[PDB]
């Protein structure tokens, strides 16, 4: 049950200067990378090519190679078309890919954001605006939908290519996706006193962290956000508010899939 994401970010500072960078995620692991400086798409995993042959990848990369150059000049022309309604700087983001389900089931998406706000999607056989989008976008939508060749290609990428590519990507990447990295915990106290239980280096993301006195769970436990490490593991800290002098007897218990029933209990 994984989500495949192609994240494109494009910045247009003025009429001339323009930049487009992309990253590809399968779940929470990066598979591809495409810097503006690079003519080619880079693999960040050994298995990023999936079950595609070299001829299949070259043909697919070339399509995107043409797209980046085309998209860049397209936007610039669309700005000219709407002037002076819209102007630089312009930020355009694309979130494309497909969500995988048990068996041969999937659902594909292609979402477009303009100035940090979701406005356009490809749905069915055409581009369309979503609820909340400005009306001026109806002309760009009308212009993009005129391009039958693009429409047929995008349909093929969403309906056929994405599901097939990721389905083969899960086979070649089974080893990395199902890896089990053990968490390591440590404790600290910050005056305000607040006890902090740091948990770092665990994979996958699902983890259970709670402050406890013996067999009693403490209700005041506040989990932070999941923070990433450089080595593609996760970091999380849980805070508990206590009166000074009541630290004794408290312990942090950590449950994770890698430990295998051997929960880390850290006493203060």
């Amino acid at each position, epitope marked *: 049950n994984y989500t495949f994401r192609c994240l494109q970010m494009s910045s247009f500072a003025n009429r001339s200067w323009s930049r487009t960078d992309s990253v590809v995620w399968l779940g929470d692991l990066q598979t591809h990378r495409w810097s503006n400086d690079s003519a080619t798409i880079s693999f960040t995993k050994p298995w990023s090519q999936g079950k595609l042959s070299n001829q299949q990848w070259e043909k697919l990369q070339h399509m995107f190679q*043409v797209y980046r150059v*085309s998209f860049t000049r397209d936007i610039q022309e*669309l700005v*000219k078309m709407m002037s002076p309604k819209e102007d630089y700087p312009i930020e355009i983001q694309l979130s494309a890919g497909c969500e995988m389900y048990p068996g041969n089931a999937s659902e594909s998406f292609l979402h477009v954001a303009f100035q940090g706000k979701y406005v356009v999607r490809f749905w069915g056989t055409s581009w369309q605006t979503v609820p909340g989008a400005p009306s001026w976008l109806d002309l760009p939508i009308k212009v993009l939908n*005129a391009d*039958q*060749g693009t429409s047929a290609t995008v349909q093929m990428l969403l309906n056929d290519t994405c599901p097939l590519f990721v389905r083969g990507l899960l086979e070649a990447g089974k080893s990395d996706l199902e890896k089990q990295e053990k968490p390591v915990a440590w404790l600290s106290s910050v005056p305000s006193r607040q006890l902090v239980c740091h948990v770092s280096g665990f994979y996958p993301k699902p983890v259970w962290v709670m402050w406890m006195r013996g067999d009693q769970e403490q209700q005041g436990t506040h989990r932070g956000d999941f923070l990433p490490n450089a080595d593609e593991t996760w970091y999380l800290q849980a805070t508990l508010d206590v009166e000074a002098g009541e630290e004794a007897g408290l312990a942090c218990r950590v449950k994770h899939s890698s430990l295998g029933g051997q929960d880390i209990i850290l006493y203060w």
Partner: T-cell receptor
Amino acid sequence: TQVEQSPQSLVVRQGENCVLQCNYSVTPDNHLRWFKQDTGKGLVSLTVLVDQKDKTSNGRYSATLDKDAKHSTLHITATLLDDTATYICVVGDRGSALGRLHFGAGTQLIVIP
Amino acid sequence: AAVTQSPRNKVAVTGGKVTLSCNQTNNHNNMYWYRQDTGHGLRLIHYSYGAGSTEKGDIPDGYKASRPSQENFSLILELATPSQTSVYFCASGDEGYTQYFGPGTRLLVLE
């Protein structure tokens, strides 16, 4: 130049067949169009090629397009005097108004009646 | 989808103001100006995406464009030169790729 045409000049007798080549380097290549232009006149569209490997016909004109080879030919069957004109190859880089048209210098055809 | 050009032929002097105009009643948002010269295909000078809009083409130098309305698109030569002796084609189109061309305008700029 991104659009090249061959031959440059062409002299042919009435009733004879001729083929006109168009090679290009335009990226990307959405469609290819052939124009006919009488000496100092307008641009009359003869045909439009749109598919990866396309074939079109229009009376005595027939055309092909190979987008892997970036190449197009225009065949004129049984040439008449009125065919004496310049023939222009045009490539559009988009399937919409966002496209720029790339023009060939043309092929000059003279048909001897 | 008809497109007319006026004038169809013009003899002008160097330094004179020349206004080449074309009309289109097709309700097309987009209009384009090209020039044709021996040994070259048509080359884009200026184009428009609607009233008030003017955009530089591939060879805009020595030319000014004007789009006062949806119907009219004018190519203006403020200071004419003999190098601007050409055949000028105007074209219009909607969102599609098809550009509908006018009959052309012969211009000769003498010294």
